[PDB]
């Protein structure tokens, strides 16, 4: 099954100006060369405009699959995000019959076991 693609059935010229990742160095659409994107377009339109972090390297936490360190640090760096995530169905996906049911079908579709959906 083809991976999810927001730009399915779109011509190559359309994906070249809307999906292909320029930085903040360019705009988007047919007039992409006439302006530059606003800073927050990193977050509003990530595929086209997101750029990697520049202050604290996150690679070592990804390279050794340290999902635990994501929580240990952001528990204190951004407590609000963790409080939301700990309270969401992604943290407790098998806590109700409804959640357990939808999670089971997702486990079959992705070929994996999902006891929680993590920041990773």
């Amino acid at each position: 099954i083809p991976p999810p693609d927001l730009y399915k059935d779109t011509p190559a010229w359309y994906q070249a100006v809307y999906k292909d990742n320029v930085g903040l160095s360019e705009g988007s659409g047919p007039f992409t060369k006439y302006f530059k994107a606003q800073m927050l377009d990193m977050y509003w339109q990530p595929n086209r405009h997101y750029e990697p972090m520049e202050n604290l390297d996150h690679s070592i936490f990804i390279e050794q699959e340290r999902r635990d360190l994501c929580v240990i640090c952001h528990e204190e760096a951004t407590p609000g995000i963790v409080a939301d995530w700990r309270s969401s169905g992604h943290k407790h996906p098998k806590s109700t019959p409804y959640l357990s049911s939808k999670t089971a079908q997702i486990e079959k579709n992705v070929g994996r076991v999902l006891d929680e959906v993590h920041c990773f």
Binding site: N55, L56, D57, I60, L69, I72, C73, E76, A77
Partner: protein, 220 residues
């Protein structure tokens, strides 16, 4: 393992890649992300370390620094660095030491002797409750239950000029470690750079175990 006295290129790089973003390029606790971080990352240039095995005012031993790096500091963004190798964590100890001239002129005082932890009883807890509430009035900063909501709590400040309001320790996540030996060490050594002093002189070894037992009693 063995912690070197010499500064190495590997030690520079490990600090650069894993410590500079918070503690600053020169250990001044002034990395870019320190502007929005609370608690603030340690300014190593003062030679003031909260968590030691040495008395109040002394430098930390090389083992004290390696321990804090490995274990991390709860209630802060200071994660454990067990993700790094034994040698990597040891090679950054002199880098942190090179940030303060105090390490080059004075030698760290001898480590204190913990002794044997006393057996907690109903008697020892009440003797610590008396010290905590009457003899030394710890509820001033920490509150009656240790919630960190005492009258003098909001006004406390670092020696770096930063607000240090005593965190709620009823969760049991002490910054220096949640062991009874760890808490006893804090009362015997004091936290350099903070208004939390050493009680090695005001109290005997037994009385600080009494006090430790009551502090652990306040945890949930």
């Amino acid at each position: 393992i063995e912690i070197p006295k010499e500064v190495t290129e590997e030690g520079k790089n490990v600090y650069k890649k894993y410590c500079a973003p918070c503690h600053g390029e020169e250990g001044g606790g002034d990395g870019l992300l320190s502007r929005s971080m609370l608690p603030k990352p340690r300014n190593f240039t003062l030679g003031a370390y909260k968590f030691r095995t040495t008395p109040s005012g002394s430098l930390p031993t090389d083992e004290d620094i390696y321990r804090t790096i490995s274990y991390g500091v709860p209630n802060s963004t200071m994660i454990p660095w067990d993700i790094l190798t034994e040698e990597q964590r040891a090679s950054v100890v002199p880098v942190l030491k090179s940030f303060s001239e105090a390490f080059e002129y004075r030698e760290p005082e001898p480590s204190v002797d913990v002794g044997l932890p006393l057996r907690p009883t109903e008697r020892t807890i009440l003797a610590g409750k008396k010290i905590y509430e009457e003899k030394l009035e710890c509820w001033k900063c920490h509150g009656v239950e240790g919630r960190g909501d005492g009258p003098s709590a909001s006004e406390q400040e670092d020696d770096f000029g930063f607000p240090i309001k005593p965190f709620d320790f009823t969760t049991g996540k002490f910054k220096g470690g949640n062991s009874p030996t760890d808490v006893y060490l804090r009362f015997t050594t004091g936290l350099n750079g903070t208004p939390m002093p050493s009680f090695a002189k005001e109290l005997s070894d037994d009385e600080r175990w009494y006090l430790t037992h009551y502090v652990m009693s306040l945890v949930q």
